[PDB]
Design a protein around this nucleic acid. Structure first.
Lengths: 411, 555
DNA sequence: CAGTCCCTGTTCGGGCGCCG
DNA sequence: GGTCGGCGCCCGAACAGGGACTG
């Protein structure tokens, strides 16, 4: 007995047409049980080949979670409805969420199943469930309610969500609540004890309206990775050549970097292992260049109209660095991850972990997901990444092949 | 016209166009008899109906003989209707494989006769399926029919029958859960661990459940005794094999004959191990005519004789046992060729295969081995839904050295080392620190875009020097030439300084094969060395001898 | 400064195999 | 003269995106 909000694609764009990739047995079994149960609850219904649209589907398990979770790769459908969840019914991003001491994530995707979907738009939510060894043809479905992982779902549910959070935001006006996709970010400066207590109050406050886990964050402890020069007392020809090359690359970001007095120490055709004393004019150029790296880059700020971009570099020994930017060399944030799950044994698991951590930070700081430049071969990533995904959203990515220049972001 | 028991599928046209209006082809008198004989028969059974002048649509039609039968097949040239019919999403995601089947007590195969003509078409769409049957006389106006069922040649016919068939089988497969029904078009592989008594009862229940919707299971295509002919294989109670493959024995080979040869060799490689089509595929490159005669090379004749000898011995595959682990073992065949075998018991192959794709201009065996592992992994998940355990001809320490030092993310699933030469290894290792007591070569090279002339040389810390003029070259080839010179004129341990990102990006990937002959010579010189340290410095910055050698190779 | 070109990688069109 | 859909392989042509050099 609920009225449906009419939704349309962006003008001049058809629906998504993406093939379903192979799934493992444990994933296919977990999807047949969930879809049959969701079909019994009227959430989805079977369809036929007259629907030319299709979106890939697979299953995940969140961190320390036994229960499987259905996940649809609506990235193509979200690109073709971008004018809806921005111009019409967007969500404001609180600039204070990134400043809180503790921020918790709540999977509230189950609440979207209460609102019906516009009848004309259900044709685009179509997805196919594959079978092992192609025993049976594709078992296709379409969504009758608000689908999880669709950017239009939190937009339509926003009005209903504000009225549920109103009794809680009144009693707690100092707590920041942000909604992104199937997730609800709740941040507070309270002590770690009473913070989790207020979370349980919000959990029971959501259970009485029809809605169970928790992932804790600490944005006040988020650190950045600056560019650092080595503190060597005896410099060789090879060290000075590596230092000049790094300062030459860094000069694209800090225009005040000079390498004139240091390059003068590399005049003769000397052996790389030969020790070179630093002149008086070179020692000052090195100390001054160390101070410019302490200064912030001039004219860097977040532009809400531009897209975020993330680059990741594999530094070995379980070390991974990253930079987020909108315009090249105008990095909004840098950092380095170390000792993640799969360190010293699995690179793909570490890369998957890094992307999820970075995307999480991009949601807390700017409320956007970046487009990643992944240091991996496409076929290597497209084979293993679903085995390690533990998030309800999926960022966009491309694949780069950049051999190491002068190790700019890690000593 | 009576109503079909099967629910119909609503089909539309693309917004902004109408039905087909094409003239009929001149048909032979032997095909005219075959069409009028079937058109008057399908009209009696309610499959096609007459239409008057109110149908302004028309499409061609012809006939093709059936294989090993005197019956004809009616095909419609719906190429103009398909370009206007709505797009469909095909539900056939792949092809089943016998290696994915599990051992069942009782097995039954049956085929539905005339499947398309037993599934109804949409009521509002029958008007666009209008065609004309030319009579024996060119002056006769001819008979005009329209389809009431799924035609043959329409792009929506296969998808509709597959989806309609699955909806009819769901109530049976819901009541009989332990019955494995492989559904591929009209072939129904039915198996069960039930006793042979209750098995035939369930088969007749299915033959009556399918009969309630217009689907006939004739006893002609019914199969009750092994070996079963299913999807082009021969299913025996304990093994399987492909149906007999016939290779052409032409004395003069054309380009199209090689494609038919390569096509059947790839089909044979799924169970016949060791098939190589490297030298035979080298005959298809740079050719333009399908009917152009091409002679067989000495390497192609040797590769063809080896594949024929493998096809002489009979090979067979086993079935999948979910109780025991899945093992996959790869071998380095030729230069750029890999073969693998997937099995659960030693020498009892589920299936075999080959990987020989050349990705990029510069590569090594570790890269190609990783690509092959990935191809096997995806293939394994399609057929069995799991990733096999790998036995790889590469040392554990070899792989550990590669993936930890590589800049790209790379990984191989749970694997173990098998000692089967040839082994995959890294042919040279670049040092991480400059070598003490090694001569330091500052190389550079430049060229001119117009004259295509350039120089390439080096300057060392011991005063050594060389410059070489180069003709018909580029800036990139000269910078590689300057490093090739430094390797030739140096000892076993040598430090090399360059300003070329392009050259450094190639050598650090540790390639062992390349499409460029200059790179292969750089590789051969790097293997001869004991310690090599490369280094990059920015150009035009007056750095060491890199500015002195930049001025020598300027012209 | 934007314009090329040298290089490499990806994507897609088209032939065959196989199945219904 | 020659129908549709699916999957696989092989090739070349067209597309494309980055780096060093030049008006």
């Amino acid at each position: 007995p609920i009225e449906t909000v009419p939704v349309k694609l962006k003008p001049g764009m058809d629906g998504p047409k993406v093939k379903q990739w192979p799934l493992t047995e444990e994933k296919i079994k977990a999807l047949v049980e969930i879809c049959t149960e969701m079909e019994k609850e009227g959430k989805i219904s079977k369809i036929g080949p007259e629907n030319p649209y299709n979106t890939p589907v697979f299953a995940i398990k969140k961190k320390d979670s036994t229960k499987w979770r259905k996940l649809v790769d609506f990235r193509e459908l979200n690109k073709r409805t971008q004018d809806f969840w921005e111009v019409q019914l967007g969500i404001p991003h609180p600039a204070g969420l990134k400043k809180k001491k503790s921020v918790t994530v709540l999977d509230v995707g189950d609440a979207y199943f209460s609102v019906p979907l516009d009848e004309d738009f259900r044709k685009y939510t179509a997805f196919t469930i594959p079978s092992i060894n192609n025993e049976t043809p594709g078992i296709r479905y379409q969504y009758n309610v608000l689908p999880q992982g669709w950017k239009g779902s939190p937009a339509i549910f926003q009005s209903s969500m504000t009225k549920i959070l109103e009794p809680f935001k009144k009693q707690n006006p100092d707590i920041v609540i942000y909604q992104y996709m199937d997730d609800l970010y709740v941040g507070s400066d309270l002590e770690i004890g009473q913070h989790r207590t207020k979370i349980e109050e919000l959990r029971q406050h959501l259970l009485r309206w029809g809605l169970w886990m928790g992932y804790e964050l600490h944005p006040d402890k988020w650190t950045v990775q600056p560019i650092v020069l080595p503190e060597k007392d005896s410099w060789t020809v090879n060290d000075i050549q590596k230092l000049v090359g790094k300062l030459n690359w860094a000069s694209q970001i800090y225009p005040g970097i000079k390498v004139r007095q240091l390059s003068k120490l590399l005049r003769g055709t000397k052996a790389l292992t030969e020790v070179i004393p630093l002149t008086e004019e070179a020692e000052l150029e090195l100390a001054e260049n160390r101070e410019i790296l302490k200064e912030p880059v001039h004219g860097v700020y977040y532009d809400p109209s531009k897209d975020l971009i993330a680059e990741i570099q594999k530094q070995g020994q379980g070390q991974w660095t990253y930079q987020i930017y909108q315009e090249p060399f105008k990095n909004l944030k840098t950092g380095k991850y170390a000792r993640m799950r799969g360190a010293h044994t699995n690179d793909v698991k570490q890369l998957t972990e890094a992307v999820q951590k970075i995307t999480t930070e991009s949601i807390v700081i700017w409320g956007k997901t970046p487009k990643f430049k992944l240091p991996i071969q496409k076929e290597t990533w497209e084979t293993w990444w679903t085995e390690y995904w533990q998030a309800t959203w999926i960022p966009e990515w491309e694949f780069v092949n950049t051999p190491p220049l002068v190790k700019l972001w890690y000593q | 016209v009576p109503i079909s028991p099967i629910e119909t599928v609503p089909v539309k046209l693309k917004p902004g166009m109408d039905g087909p209006k094409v003239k009929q082809w001149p048909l032979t008198e032997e095909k005219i008899k075959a069409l009028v004989e079937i058109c008057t028969e399908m009209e009696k059974e309610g499959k096609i109906s007459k239409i008057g002048p109110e149908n302004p649509y028309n499409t061609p039609v012809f006939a093709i003989k059936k294989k090993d039968s005197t019956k004809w097949r009616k095909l419609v040239d719906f190429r103009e209707l398909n370009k206007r019919t709505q797009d469909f999403w095909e539900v056939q995601l792949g092809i089943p494989h016998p290696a994915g089947l599990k051992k069942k007590k009782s097995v039954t195969v049956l085929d539905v006769g005339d499947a398309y003509f037993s599934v109804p078409l949409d009521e509002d769409f029958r008007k666009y399926t209008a065609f004309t049957i030319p009579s024996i006389n060119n002056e006769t106006p001819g008979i005009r029919y329209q389809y009431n069922v799924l035609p043959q040649g329409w792009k929506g016919s296969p998808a509709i029958f597959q989806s309609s068939m699955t909806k009819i089988l769901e109530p049976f497969k819901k009541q009989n859960p332990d019955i494995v029904i492989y559904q591929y078009m009209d072939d129904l592989y039915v198996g069960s661990d039930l006793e042979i008594g209750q098995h035939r009862t369930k088969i007749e229940e299915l033959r009556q459940h399918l009969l309630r919707w217009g689907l006939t299971t004739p006893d002609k295509k019914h199969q009750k005794e092994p070996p079963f002919l299913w999807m082009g294989y021969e299913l025996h109670p304990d093994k399987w094999t492909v149906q007999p493959i016939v290779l052409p024995e032409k004395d003069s080979w054309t380009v199209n004959d090689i494609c038919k040869l390569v096509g059947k060799l790839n089909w044979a490689s799924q169970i016949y191990p060791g098939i190589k089509v490297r030298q035979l595929s080298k005959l298809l490159r740079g050719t333009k005519a399908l009917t152009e005669v091409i002679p067989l090379t000495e390497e192609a004749e040797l590769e063809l004789a080896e594949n024929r000898e493998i096809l002489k011995e009979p090979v067979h595959g086993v079935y999948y046992d979910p109780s025991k682990d899945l093992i996959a073992e790869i071998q380095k065949q030729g230069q750029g060729q890999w073969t693998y075998q997937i099995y659960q018991e030693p020498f009892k192959n589920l299936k075999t295969g080959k990987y020989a794709r050349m990705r990029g201009a510069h590569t090594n065996d570790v890269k190609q081995l990783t690509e092959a592992v990935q191809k096997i992994t995806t293939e394994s998940i399609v057929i069995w839904g799991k990733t096999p355990k790998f036995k790889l001809p590469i040392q554990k320490e070899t792989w550990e050295t590669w993936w930890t030092e590589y800049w790209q993310a790379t990984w191989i699933p749970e694997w173990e080392f098998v000692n089967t030469p040839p082994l995959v290894k890294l042919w040279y290792q670049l040092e991480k620190e400059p070598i003490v007591g090694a001569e330091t070569f500052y190389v550079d090279g430049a060229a001119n875009r117009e004259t295509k002339l350039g120089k390439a040389g080096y300057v060392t810390n011991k005063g050594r020097q060389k410059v070489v003029p180069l003709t018909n070259t580029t800036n990139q080839k000269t910078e590689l030439q300057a490093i090739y010179l430094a390797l030739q004129d140096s000892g076993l341990e040598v430090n090399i300084v360059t300003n070329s990102q392009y050259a450094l990006g190639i050598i650090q990937a540790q390639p062992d094969k390349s499409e460029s002959e200059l790179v292969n010579q750089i590789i051969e010189q790097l293997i001869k060395k004991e310690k090599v340290y490369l280094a990059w410095v920015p150009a035009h910055k007056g750095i060491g001898g890199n500015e002195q050698v930049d001025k020598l190779v300027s012209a």
